[PDB]
Amino acid sequence: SRLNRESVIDAALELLNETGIDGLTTRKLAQKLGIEQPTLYWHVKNKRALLDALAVEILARHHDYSLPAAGESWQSFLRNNAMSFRRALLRYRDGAKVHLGTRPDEKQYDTVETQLRFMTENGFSLRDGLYAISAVSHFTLGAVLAQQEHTAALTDRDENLPPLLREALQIMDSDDGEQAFLHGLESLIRGFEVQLTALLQIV
Template sequence: MAGSRSPRLSRESVMRAALQLLGEVGIDGLSTRRLAERLGVQSPTLYWHFRNKGELLAAMAEAIMRERHRQPLPAPGQSWQAWFIANAHSFRQALLEYRDGARLHAGTRPRGEVFGDVEAKLGVLVDAGFAPAQAIELLLAVSRFVVGWVLEEQAAPAAAPVTGEAPDAARYPLAAQGWAALAEESADQVFDRQLRLFVAGAEAMAGQSRGAG
């Protein structure tokens, strides 16, 4: 059995080919059969490197985060709030760089060395006054917000990535007014403002954690 492993392939080369194929056919078209054809091997050969498709998808998602998502700790003098917002922007951009990037990432969980990045981020928030459980909740909440936001962006028409079709102003005047205001801004601007809602709520939560109650 060992002799059947293709000398041309490695775990890395399989994963890189899968990322390239993702860009061409999307996640729905990404199959082990198609990937094997791209690599010039039989499908069972891939299982020398990845036990199943789920493991391959998880490795692809980790590669995108490792290479496209910058995860620096706050610069000297930078507030946790500014770092938190910048980090979320970077996460969003990393997902947007790949076709179906958000769908690929959705459902993944930290594992292995990824916990080192998580621990460093938790340390920043704990130093800012959050309890460890609160810090985890905040990271989880913003992560799911970003993934959900990008899922919508990658599924929406390019012409209206945030608001879509405007409501009838005569029947829905409040909605129409809000839609019109959002339509004047870019998706980046709306995303940034909504991130700041997280920060505002988190600041109140951190204050409570330091209180007597």
């Protein structure tokens, strides 16, 4: 079939949902595109190059809150950005693992620069603005990977549970982690705010 960049990425994402990141191979992508492995090679040099592109294209296609709205507070921006980032990572099997270890791509430079600038224009130093963006990013990726990797490992396999653990697993498994993620996200944003507002005051 068609091997332009957009068609390759469509087929790779389709394959990702069927196989997960570990079982995703260029050999299985060739089968799905109806081509021989050396044909695919001209287009897609290895698995690493494929994963690097998927990580970019998943946010391009499905992360619709990269940028603040005109006049939006930094608190509201981080909340909306994290909810969007989370949605985009969950939309594909092993989506957080696909994002992990990447750094912003050249196609993302204007986006991420605007996010860092916006934090500095709302009274954060670059460093404190970066620490908040990194904390939100790590917390959101951690929460998604815990969800996704939990699903995954459920293709492996106690009445011996002590009672608070038993109840805690009941609670954790009552949604895709949305409740726990949103509660933690408010805690993190509020902690950022207490720090920003404090200036040089002992806090």
